[PDB]
Design a protein around this ligand. Structure first.
Ligand code: CA
Ligand code: CA
Length: 314
DNA sequence: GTAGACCTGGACG
DNA sequence: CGTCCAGGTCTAC
């Protein structure tokens, strides 16, 4: 009871709640939907992972988001630490207001929106988001998830252990830019992305002015941020969009992958009209992105997150 | 602006 | 056992 991952039932006194209706957040529809690849449902309906450099377990009731943290001396989370969670799930953003708007201008979103409530966007750390998505290219979520895990296990700070699970924080640029990192990542099976990781880490540290260069993109504009990110190895339009949307506060950024392409064709009968290409191409992918923006608005990225998530549950 | 190939490994035939 | 195929990016014409 004092060991292993906690559950709301077993260690009652160690959980603190945050008012949050399932209409505003559905953990099972956000955490395993390829925004963050670091959450695991260790026990039914309980998700644990690293947030704000500490390990947490989250679970929800119809009107509450229950939280518990593992830092010395087991205690319920504090209001300050709880804010860390609120900020991670960007709770100041009312999802009901967004769904209502998207639903108003897009009949198809409406239909899907009724079956998939609470799909919101996580506010992620730039470094973790940058390297996790460099790992997502031409790959499948199950594999991506493993890659990221082994990568953190080998190069990230060790935090605490629950059961047989040792949690690690996300690696720093220095660690990823270290000597022989590529070869070690290839042994961990990242394929050719192994080179993308060490190259992009070194590129950022020895050419772009380090971490500061990335974090300042949050104040920068979407157009600039997206272009800057495309400088890095392994980072194309799609990965860059994922980063702008999920880590740089660019809510209009719209990732265009195989999923969003199928969705566009199947649910909107969309086809490239200004691009020469007939199928996926750097030009058409860009047009689709603008298409979704002119359909959903300033938060088109968040609308994209709802349909992508729903298309996964298929 | 456009075909090909490219690490890895779980589903098709 | 052996081809797509997955939250694509890159590079040769
Ligand atoms: Ca693909
Ligand atoms: Ca690039």
């Amino acid at each position: 009871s004092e060991f292993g991952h906690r559950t709301l039932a077993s260690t009652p006194a160690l959980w603190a709640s945050i008012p949050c209706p399932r209409s505003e957040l559905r953990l099972d529809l956000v955490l395993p939907s390829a925004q963050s690849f670091r959450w695991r449902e260790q026990s039914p309906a309980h998700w644990s992972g690293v947030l704000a450099d500490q390990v947490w377990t989250l679970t929800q009731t119809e009107e509450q988001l229950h939280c518990t943290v593992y830092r010395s001396q087991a205690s319920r989370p504090t209001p300050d630490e709880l804010e860390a969670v609120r900020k991670y799930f960007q709770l100041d953003v009312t999802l009901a207001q967004l769904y209502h708007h998207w639903g108003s201008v897009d009949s198809h979103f409406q239909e899907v929106a009724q079956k998939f409530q609470g799909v919101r966007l996580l506010r992620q750390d730039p470094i973790e988001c940058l390297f996790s998505f460099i790992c997502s290219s031409n790959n499948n979520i199950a594999r991506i998830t493993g890659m990221v895990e082994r990568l953190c296990q080998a190069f990230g700070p060790r935090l605490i252990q629950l059961d047989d699970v040792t949690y690690h924080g996300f690696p720093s640029l220095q660690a990823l830019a270290g000597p022989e990192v590529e070869a070690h990542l290839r042994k961990l099976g990242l394929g050719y992305r192994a080179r993308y990781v060490s190259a992009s880490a070194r590129a950022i540290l020895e050419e772009q002015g380090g971490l500061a260069w990335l974090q300042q993109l949050r104040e920068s504009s979407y157009e600039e941020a997206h272009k800057a990110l495309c400088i890095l190895p392994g980072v194309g339009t799609q990965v860059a969009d994922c980063i702008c949307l999920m880590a740089l506060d660019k809510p209009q950024a719209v990732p265009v992958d195989v999923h969003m392409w199928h969705i566009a064709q199947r649910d909107y009968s969309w086809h490239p009209t200004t691009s020469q290409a007939k199928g996926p191409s750097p030009q058409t992918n860009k047009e689709l992105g603008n298409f979704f923006r002119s359909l959903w608005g300033p938060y088109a990225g968040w609308a994209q997150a709802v349909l992508f998530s729903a298309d996964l549950r298929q």
